[PDB]
Amino acid sequence: MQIFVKTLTGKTITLEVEPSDTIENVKAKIQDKEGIPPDQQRLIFAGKQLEDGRTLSDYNIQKESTLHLVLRLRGG
């Protein structure tokens, strides 16, 4: 499917994904398209945080939905 990723600075990118894609796959596509490492990416749809290891289907992500991309620095 086609989805969209709106950043926090008012920028939007277009992604090609499938519900079977894990979150690190989506962050990896965002990396290929933008150069932002998946470590510095916090994805949120409808307030819910997209956890690594889960899939897009684990959330109510429909075709041409728009996720929110926050740029962070990991602590751990």
From Swiss-Prot:
- Point out the annotated site residues (description: Essential for function): H68
Task: Report the outcome of S65D.
Answer: Phosphomimetic mutant that binds and activates PRKN
Taxonomic superkingdom: Eukaryota
Ubiquitin-like domain: which residues? 1-76
Indicate where this protein resides in the cell.
Answer: Cytoplasm; Nucleus; Mitochondrion outer membrane
Summarizing the annotation, the consequence of altering G76A is: Loss of ADP-ribosylation
- Its membrane topology, per UniProt? Peripheral membrane protein
* PTM annotation (ADP-ribosylglycine): residues: G76
Q: Where is this cross-link: Glycyl lysine isopeptide (Lys-Gly) (interchain with G-Cter in ubiquitin)?
A: K6, K11, K27, K29, K33, K48, K63
Q: How is it modified after translation?
A: Phosphorylated at Ser-65 by PINK1 during mitophagy. Phosphorylated ubiquitin specifically binds and activates parkin (PRKN), triggering mitophagy. Phosphorylation does not affect E1-mediated E2 charging of ubiquitin but affects discharging of E2 enzymes to form polyubiquitin chains. It also affects deubiquitination by deubiquitinase enzymes such as USP30.
Look up what happens after changing H68G: Loss of DTX3L-mediated polyubiquitination of histone H3 and H4
Q: Where along the sequence does the record put site: Interacts with activating enzyme?
A: R54, R72
Modification (Microbial infection) ADP-ribosylthreonine occurs at: T66
**Phosphoserine: modified positions:** S65
Q: What is the effect of changing S65A?
A: Prevents phosphorylation in case of mitophagy. Decreased localization of PRKN to mitochondria
Q: Where is the Glycyl lysine isopeptide (Gly-Lys) (interchain with K-? in acceptor proteins) crosslink found in the sequence?
A: G76
Q: What does this protein do?
A: Exists either covalently attached to another protein, or free (unanchored). When covalently bound, it is conjugated to target proteins via an isopeptide bond either as a monomer (monoubiquitin), a polymer linked via different Lys residues of the ubiquitin (polyubiquitin chains) or a linear polymer linked via the initiator Met of the ubiquitin (linear polyubiquitin chains).
Q: Mind telling me what this protein is named?
A: Ubiquitin
